[model samples]
Target: AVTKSSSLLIVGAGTWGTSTALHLARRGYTNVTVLDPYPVPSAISAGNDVNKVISSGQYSNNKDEIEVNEILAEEAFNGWKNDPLFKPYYHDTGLLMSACSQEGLDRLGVRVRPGEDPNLVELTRPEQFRKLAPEGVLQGDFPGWKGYFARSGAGWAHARNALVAAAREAQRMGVKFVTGTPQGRVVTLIFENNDVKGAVTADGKIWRAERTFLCAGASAGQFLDFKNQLRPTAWTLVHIALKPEERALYKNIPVIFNIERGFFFEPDEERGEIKICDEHPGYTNMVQSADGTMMSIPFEKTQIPKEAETRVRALLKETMPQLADRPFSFARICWCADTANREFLIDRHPQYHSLVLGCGASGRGFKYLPSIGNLIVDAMEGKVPQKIHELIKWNPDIAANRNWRDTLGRFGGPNRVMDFHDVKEWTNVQYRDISK
Candidate 1:
């Protein structure tokens, strides 16, 4: 049974893992311990980004997803607004989600339309988009782009700094963090008669706990047999550094997200850089496991694939043509744990009662950084809302039939599920300079 003094442990110090530790500490869990291959805001974590989108006032065809978002968004906005550690990181410049394809437009219509919500203003003409952005910001010819601009309740958060803030707070609350390899790197789950005793570290050291959270992110599949429930996915992230004079021009702008093209956030004033992400199903790193079963694993690398650059350029060329030819100031392949249904796997392990599975980000977990931890905690205690519990429950059958090839909300990517090994060429890949 779980209590304030239960021996608790969390693996993976990313968004969800860090948040779980923070919540545990807050709830008076005295014996909380967190482990990871890196420190808080792990460089490999998808949440370790410059900024992440935060919005909810959309109407997707997935009613269950919408319901979950509506509830979580309410709590998340409140947390970001009132929480001292998180408030400073929130940038409420607003959001604009648009699309070019007819199907995309149709789906966008369902997400938000004129008269449906006064805050969501439908945009069919270029003037509408320009009205949202500053003059000369969007210089592309008026193409068939159409969607709505949310005037409120949407924006982004300084992701890394916010996660760091949480880590600091959790530390102050007595949560212990052990990072780096051997000790922090969990190599296996300590199982005893089907009940999880805890986790075994990389060096064969066992850290026993009454409850252990498996938040290993994209690499979770590498540690356990997920029954193909999770697919480790990767996406390219490229940032454009604005000229000093152009920095102010890029600040305080709405988060522009085009379903068919890509998405770009406002300039990060510190680096004078603005991040862009080309949306898609995202690529998976498929490899055969020791048991001869095919599974997805996350690999570390700094370079982005050549085709990714094409998509990035194509997006800039279509939306903001003037910046189309600019060399990327920074670029890397960011990854996340993906589920076929785009729902999180926040359920107790079907077999191991002492372990909770918290993977399956599906490229959208960062937005819930502030409030998702509570849901995860509730899940740990078997106290999540019934509908949401059903939506995110452990069901191996769903994983067996995981397929998003013909799903909605999935934007542009390769027609086939591309493997990382299939990437033959990289664009402007620079070797890491260690001679600092």
Candidate 2:
């Protein structure tokens, strides 16, 4: 049994790892240490970004998954609204989710229904959209768009900053941190009698602890073999630099997402920058694994795929045409350690009980940061929910189909999965006017 003073070692200082360390430190854990290749908000973490769409019920297709998400979402929703560490970053701007095609509308309806979630307000026409969206934010001629606006239980957050705050607080609470590849990066786990003792850093130094949590984000799939169960998927996002006045005007704009196009969030506070992402089937990095089997790895790249540029710009043309032609100075690929099912894999290692696993963000784990660690520690103490515990296991049989539904068939760009390396040409990317 783990106690408040128990020694804990967490790998990867991203949202998952940072959240675990922060929550544990807050819970009075005395000997807590977090290791990572990068500082606080690890660049490799999918949640380490400008912003991400947050919804209580707009993320799942299965009824079981729906219940899990809703429960966690409401818990997290309160965390964002009341937690001092998170409330400042949580804008109560609400969220607007729309779709243009018949199939798209059908899938959107599966997320939240009228009167199902009290926070969700259904919209059937452009007039309703105009009323919900911040002034001039949804200046688009809707021909077939239909969706809903989540009044309270949905929105976006300043992802990178929020994690940074958690890491800082954890440090203040005496949580030790070790960064840099040679010192903090885990090269292998120390196993003895089928149980994990700890991990060895890249420089061959052993970091011993009673309990270790592996929260390596997208890098999990590449480093460990999960029998093709965990897929390291990459999605593209580009940033728009907004002028000071423009930022003021669009300061607290609601997060808008199109089932057929993409999504965008309000301008960030520090840099007056707005982030936009194109919706499509995520890209995979297929490479030969050490054992001669082909696998999808997460490769970090600054330049995104050309298809991403085209799709994002087109999405802007449909939603806010004026911003469609604005210069795009920065772009990046966000990696999600996706599972066959969108559910997170926050359970103990099958082979090692002392070593718990907290990964498989599945592109939707950021919003749970403030409260997820509470549950992660619950798993460590064998107090997690039975249904969630069974669902997020390393077992692949539970999600045998490995289908993401609309992500595989609907949305923009190519309908089928594309290789990240296939993106050879990138045009109209990095604004021509910007100094390199």
RMSD of each predicted structure: 2.4, 3.2
- TM-score for each predicted model, relative to the true structure: 0.94, 0.91
The positional error of residue 105 in candidate 1, measured at the CA in angstroms, is 1.4
With a 3 Å backbone cut-off (N, CA, C), the pairs that clash in candidate 2 are: none
Candidate 2 lDDT by residue in tens digits, 177-266: 998778888988777888888888988899888999988888875445566567777888888888776667776767888767788888
Cα displacement (angstroms), candidate 2, residue 406, comes to 9.2
- Native-structure RMSD, model 1: 2.4
What TM-score quantifies how close candidate 2 is to the native fold?
0.91
Residue-wise lDDT of candidate 1 within 262-284, one digit each (tens)?
A: 89998886788889988776787
How many residue pairs collide in each prediction?
Answer: 1, 0
Q: How close to the true structure is residue 211 of candidate 1, measured as C-alpha lDDT? A: 91
Q: lDDT of all the models against the reference?
A: 0.80, 0.77
